[PDB]
Structure formats: C-alpha cells, structure tokens
Design an enzyme around this catalytic site. Structure first.
Site, PDB file in Angstrom:
ATOM      1  N   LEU A 296       0.847  -1.097  -0.109  1.00 61.61           N
ATOM      2  CA  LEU A 296       0.056  -0.076   0.002  1.00 61.61           C
ATOM      3  C   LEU A 296       0.989   1.235   0.001  1.00 61.61           C
ATOM      4  CD1 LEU A 296      -2.358  -1.133   3.079  1.00 61.61           C
ATOM      5  CD2 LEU A 296      -2.710  -2.207   0.679  1.00 61.61           C
TER       6      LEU A 296
ATOM      7  N   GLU B  12      -8.829   3.863   8.013  1.00 63.58           N
ATOM      8  CA  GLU B  12      -9.080   3.419   6.886  1.00 63.58           C
ATOM      9  C   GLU B  12      -9.097   1.512   7.019  1.00 63.58           C
ATOM     10  OE1 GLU B  12      -8.504   1.282   3.970  1.00 63.58           O
ATOM     11  OE2 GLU B  12     -10.408   1.993   3.431  1.00 63.58           O
TER      12      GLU B  12
HETATM   13  N1  LIG Z   1      -5.436  -0.088  -1.538  1.00 64.97           N
HETATM   14  C1  LIG Z   1      -6.042  -1.281  -1.495  1.00 64.97           C
HETATM   15  O1  LIG Z   1      -7.458  -1.363  -1.006  1.00 64.97           O
HETATM   16  C2  LIG Z   1      -5.368  -2.589  -1.843  1.00 64.97           C
HETATM   17  C3  LIG Z   1      -4.438  -2.382  -2.329  1.00 64.97           C
HETATM   18  N2  LIG Z   1      -3.868  -3.662  -2.852  1.00 64.97           N
HETATM   19  C4  LIG Z   1      -2.473  -3.600  -3.887  1.00 64.97           C
HETATM   20  O2  LIG Z   1      -2.249  -4.035  -4.761  1.00 64.97           O
HETATM   21  C5  LIG Z   1      -1.064  -4.534  -5.448  1.00 64.97           C
HETATM   22  C6  LIG Z   1      -1.267  -6.264  -5.665  1.00 64.97           C
HETATM   23  O3  LIG Z   1      -1.925  -6.297  -6.763  1.00 64.97           O
HETATM   24  P1  LIG Z   1      -1.224  -7.121  -8.093  1.00 64.97           P
HETATM   25  O4  LIG Z   1       0.044  -6.831  -8.201  1.00 64.97           O
HETATM   26  O5  LIG Z   1      -2.381  -7.075  -9.174  1.00 64.97           O
HETATM   27  O6  LIG Z   1      -1.650  -8.545  -7.676  1.00 64.97           O
HETATM   28  P2  LIG Z   1      -2.661  -9.581  -7.007  1.00 64.97           P
HETATM   29  O7  LIG Z   1      -3.120  -9.259  -5.238  1.00 64.97           O
HETATM   30  O8  LIG Z   1      -4.160  -9.013  -7.849  1.00 64.97           O
HETATM   31  O9  LIG Z   1      -2.575 -11.055  -7.508  1.00 64.97           O
HETATM   32  C7  LIG Z   1      -2.154 -11.493  -8.824  1.00 64.97           C
HETATM   33  C8  LIG Z   1      -1.895 -12.883  -8.561  1.00 64.97           C
HETATM   34  O10 LIG Z   1      -3.238 -13.590  -8.579  1.00 64.97           O
HETATM   35  C9  LIG Z   1      -3.343 -14.712  -9.172  1.00 64.97           C
HETATM   36  N3  LIG Z   1      -4.628 -14.714 -10.075  1.00 64.97           N
HETATM   37  C10 LIG Z   1      -5.136 -13.416 -10.744  1.00 64.97           C
HETATM   38  N4  LIG Z   1      -5.956 -13.592 -11.608  1.00 64.97           N
HETATM   39  C11 LIG Z   1      -6.425 -15.069 -11.077  1.00 64.97           C
HETATM   40  C12 LIG Z   1      -7.646 -15.952 -11.406  1.00 64.97           C
HETATM   41  N5  LIG Z   1      -8.587 -15.439 -12.437  1.00 64.97           N
HETATM   42  N6  LIG Z   1      -7.537 -17.201 -11.082  1.00 64.97           N
HETATM   43  C13 LIG Z   1      -6.646 -17.552 -10.089  1.00 64.97           C
HETATM   44  N7  LIG Z   1      -5.361 -16.866  -9.859  1.00 64.97           N
HETATM   45  C14 LIG Z   1      -5.448 -15.563 -10.287  1.00 64.97           C
HETATM   46  C15 LIG Z   1      -1.992 -14.895  -9.872  1.00 64.97           C
HETATM   47  O11 LIG Z   1      -1.210 -15.687  -8.928  1.00 64.97           O
HETATM   48  P3  LIG Z   1      -0.019 -16.615  -9.343  1.00 64.97           P
HETATM   49  O12 LIG Z   1       0.888 -15.747 -10.128  1.00 64.97           O
HETATM   50  O13 LIG Z   1       0.494 -17.152  -8.278  1.00 64.97           O
HETATM   51  O14 LIG Z   1      -0.682 -17.726 -10.305  1.00 64.97           O
HETATM   52  C16 LIG Z   1      -1.534 -13.462 -10.040  1.00 64.97           C
HETATM   53  O15 LIG Z   1      -0.072 -13.251 -10.100  1.00 64.97           O
HETATM   54  C17 LIG Z   1      -0.088  -4.656  -4.115  1.00 64.97           C
HETATM   55  O16 LIG Z   1       0.431  -3.354  -4.277  1.00 64.97           O
HETATM   56  C18 LIG Z   1      -1.080  -4.296  -2.999  1.00 64.97           C
HETATM   57  O17 LIG Z   1      -0.597  -3.292  -1.928  1.00 64.97           O
HETATM   58  C19 LIG Z   1      -4.154  -5.057  -2.385  1.00 64.97           C
HETATM   59  C20 LIG Z   1      -5.145  -4.864  -1.663  1.00 64.97           C
HETATM   60  C21 LIG Z   1      -5.967  -4.015  -1.428  1.00 64.97           C
HETATM   61  C1  LIG Z   2      -7.162  -1.126   4.870  1.00 66.23           C
HETATM   62  C2  LIG Z   2      -6.580  -1.964   3.484  1.00 66.23           C
HETATM   63  C3  LIG Z   2      -7.673  -1.988   2.459  1.00 66.23           C
HETATM   64  N1  LIG Z   2      -8.768  -0.948   2.551  1.00 66.23           N
HETATM   65  C4  LIG Z   2     -10.210  -0.906   1.555  1.00 66.23           C
HETATM   66  N2  LIG Z   2     -10.894  -0.394   1.680  1.00 66.23           N
HETATM   67  N3  LIG Z   2     -10.009  -2.247   0.992  1.00 66.23           N
HETATM   68  C5  LIG Z   2      -9.174  -3.288   1.104  1.00 66.23           C
HETATM   69  N4  LIG Z   2      -9.206  -4.329   0.231  1.00 66.23           N
HETATM   70  C6  LIG Z   2      -7.955  -3.212   1.907  1.00 66.23           C
HETATM   71  C7  LIG Z   2      -6.941  -4.235   2.021  1.00 66.23           C
HETATM   72  C8  LIG Z   2      -5.960  -4.987   1.958  1.00 66.23           C
HETATM   73  C9  LIG Z   2      -4.947  -5.976   1.907  1.00 66.23           C
HETATM   74  C10 LIG Z   2      -5.352  -7.273   1.977  1.00 66.23           C
HETATM   75  C11 LIG Z   2      -3.723  -5.838   3.178  1.00 66.23           C
HETATM   76  C12 LIG Z   2      -2.824  -4.978   3.210  1.00 66.23           C
HETATM   77  C13 LIG Z   2      -1.980  -5.045   4.059  1.00 66.23           C
HETATM   78  O1  LIG Z   2      -0.848  -4.254   3.854  1.00 66.23           O
HETATM   79  C14 LIG Z   2       0.149  -5.012   2.930  1.00 66.23           C
HETATM   80  C15 LIG Z   2      -2.212  -5.168   5.293  1.00 66.23           C
HETATM   81  C16 LIG Z   2      -3.436  -5.770   5.804  1.00 66.23           C
HETATM   82  N5  LIG Z   2      -3.683  -6.344   6.913  1.00 66.23           N
HETATM   83  C17 LIG Z   2      -2.724  -5.614   8.099  1.00 66.23           C
HETATM   84  C18 LIG Z   2      -3.496  -5.209   9.597  1.00 66.23           C
HETATM   85  O2  LIG Z   2      -4.767  -6.438   9.753  1.00 66.23           O
HETATM   86  C19 LIG Z   2      -5.085  -7.151   8.723  1.00 66.23           C
HETATM   87  C20 LIG Z   2      -4.883  -6.869   7.328  1.00 66.23           C
HETATM   88  C21 LIG Z   2      -4.433  -5.960   4.656  1.00 66.23           C
END
Ligand SMILES: NC(=O)C1=CN([C@@H]2O[C@H](COP(=O)(O)OP(=O)(O)OC[C@H]3O[C@@H](n4cnc5c(N)ncnc54)[C@H](OP(=O)(O)O)[C@@H]3O)[C@@H](O)[C@H]2O)C=CC1
Ligand SMILES: CCc1nc(N)nc(N)c1C#C[C@H](C)c1cc(OC)cc(N2CCOCC2)c1
Ligand SMILES: [Cl-]
Length: 225
Positions: free
Chosen positions: A23, A30
């Site tokens: 992140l 959040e």
């Molecule tokens: N701000 C937020 O609310 C959030 C932000 N993030 C951010 O997003 C980023 C990660 O995203 P990203 O890099 O796109 O990676 P993802 O978390 O989306 O994971 C991608 C992996 O998921 C697997 N995958 C994708 N599609 C499929 C499918 N259809 N079926 C089965 N497996 C699948 C593959 O794994 P494999 O390679 O093993 O086959 C792929 O490499 C990070 O920077 C993270 O911090 C994450 C959550 C929340």
């Molecule tokens: C708020 C972040 C967040 N906000 C919203 N609105 N949607 C989401 N899907 C996520 C998200 C997310 C990912 C899975 C995440 C990243 C991370 O940093 C890599 C830490 C966590 N934690 C550490 C603290 O407690 C358990 C979950 C979760």
C-alpha cells in the site's frame, strides 16, 4: 444469491491502490473500516468471505494472516482446484470465477456466508468489474500540503463508471448494522469530480467511504428452456 462486494482504498484522481507490492499509505482509520466491514455481519451465525490475489496474500503481515473471523480465499493459477481447504481459515483456488461459483452453492455454504468481499490485487480487481454487485471504495485525497505518493497499481475507473453508479446515499444502510461511523454524508468537489461519502481525515489525507452499485440493465434476454 450472496452479494459480491469489491472493497478497495484508492487515491484520487487516478485511483492508485498500490506500489511495489504494498500500500502507498498507512491509515489506521481506513484499516479499521476495512476490518469491521469485512468482519461484521448482520446475522451473528454467518461469516463473510475475503477473496484475494496471491500477491496480496503475500503482502499481508504473517501475524495478521489469515484475516481473523473471515473465510480467506487466496487465488493462484498454480493452485490445485476451484476451492480447497489447505489450512484452518484458508482456502486455495486456481480460479477467481470458479471459486465464486463454488462459494455461492447453498449446499456447500449452508447459507452461512453473508457476503463475499473481493479484497484485491489490482489484477483481481480488473477481473471483478463484471463479477461484483457493489464496490466499497475509500476515495482518498492528499490534503493540500501532502505529497502525492508514488503508485504503480490502479483501479479501473473507466470500467467502474461504465458499469456502476455512485450509490453513497445508501452507504450507511448497506453497511452491517453494528458499524458506527464518525462522519455524516457530504458532497465535495475535488479536482473537478464530485466526491460523495462519509468523510475522514488522518495524517496527510482526507478520505471518503463511498458505495458504488451496478447500473440498471435493460432486459434483452432471459434464458428459457
Ligand atoms: N489499496 C487497496 O485497497 C489494496 C491494494 N492492494 C495492492 O495491490 C497490489 C497487488 O495487486 P497485483 O500486483 O495486481 O496482485 P494480486 O493481488 O491481484 O495477485 C495477482 C495474482 O493472483 C493470481 N490470479 C490473478 N487472477 C487469477 C484468477 N483469475 N484465478 C486464479 N488466480 C488468479 C495470480 O497468481 P499466481 O502468479 O500465483 O498464479 C496473479 O499473479 C499490491 O501493491 C497491494 O498493495 C491490494 C489489496 C488492497
Ligand atoms: C485497509 C486496506 C484496505 N482498505 C480497503 N478499503 N479495501 C481493502 N481491500 C484493503 C486491503 C487490503 C490488504 C489485504 C491488506 C494489506 C496490508 O498491507 C500489505 C495489510 C493488511 N492487514 C494488516 C493489518 O490487519 C490485517 C489486514 C491488509
Ligand atoms: Cl483467465
């Protein structure tokens, strides 16, 4: 039959969500919202599911994974099948779409899942635009004095706005009943766009909890036998 809800925190205006596997910010309020929304249910006997990409799983600190009190599903192309228990509170799936079909089976789920939260991966979110019924989007804005963080992963804002409309007037009703929020519904203009939701400020950022809902669809076809 169980609602599928994308949940994400994104920085306006480009809707950036990540940088270098992590992140781009650390916002305790959040995180609290995310934890409470995905954990809490209206029915005390049900849990929610959290589905995530493999890279997102690997990003969560080892002490905090699997996310407590939620069914965790990690998706990877290298996993074995559509929905396999690999450890307590952890399912593995080699297909986002198939795992959702699997989770929606009332025989398998015993009607004890209340909601399926798609909790991300940029890659996962790209494929969820057609899958999700709703999006819970925390719209984050850097305050005037705040440096815009570097970002390399983005929510598809084009796809979102083609398929979904801003339903934030219904956010409060939509969230689990026991959740309490500090703000009140506000409409603010920001870099030309309307930002509507429940306002919070923490560190250098102002953010809005918003709800997006699928647009009305025309009736073109209904499958008959
Ligand atoms: N701000 C937020 O609310 C959030 C932000 N993030 C951010 O997003 C980023 C990660 O995203 P990203 O890099 O796109 O990676 P993802 O978390 O989306 O994971 C991608 C992996 O998921 C697997 N995958 C994708 N599609 C499929 C499918 N259809 N079926 C089965 N497996 C699948 C593959 O794994 P494999 O390679 O093993 O086959 C792929 O490499 C990070 O920077 C993270 O911090 C994450 C959550 C929340
Ligand atoms: C708020 C972040 C967040 N906000 C919203 N609105 N949607 C989401 N899907 C996520 C998200 C997310 C990912 C899975 C995440 C990243 C991370 O940093 C890599 C830490 C966590 N934690 C550490 C603290 O407690 C358990 C979950 C979760
Ligand atoms: Cl695919």
């Amino acid at each position: 039959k169980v609602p599928v809800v994308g949940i994400v925190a994104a920085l306006l205006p480009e809707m950036g969500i990540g940088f270098q596997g992590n992140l781009p910010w650390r916002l305790a309020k959040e995180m609290k919202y995310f934890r409470e929304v995905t954990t809490l249910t209206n029915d005390n006997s049900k849990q929610n599911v959290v589905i995530m990409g493999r890279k997102t799983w690997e990003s969560i600190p080892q002490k905090f994974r699997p996310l407590p009190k939620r069914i965790n599903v990690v998706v990877s192309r290298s996993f074995d099948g559509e929905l396999r228990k690999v450890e307590d509170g952890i399912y593995h799936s080699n297909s986002l779409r198939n795992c959702l079909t699997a989770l929606q089976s009332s025989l398998a789920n015993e009607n004890k899942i209340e909601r399926i939260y798609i909790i991300g991966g940029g890659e996962i979110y790209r494929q969820s635009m057609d899958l999700a019924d709703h999006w819970l989007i925390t719209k984050i804005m850097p305050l005037p004095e705040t440096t815009i963080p570097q970002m390399d992963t983005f929510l598809q804002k084009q796809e979102l706005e083609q398929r979904f409309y801003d339903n934030s007037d219904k956010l409060v009703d939509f969230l689990p009943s026991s959740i309490q929020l500090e703000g009140r519904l506000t409409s603010q203009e920001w870099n030309g766009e309307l930002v509507k939701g429940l306002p919070v400020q923490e560190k250098g950022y102002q953010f809005y909890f918003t709800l997006y809902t699928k647009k009305l669809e025309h009736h073109h076809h209904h499958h008959h036998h």
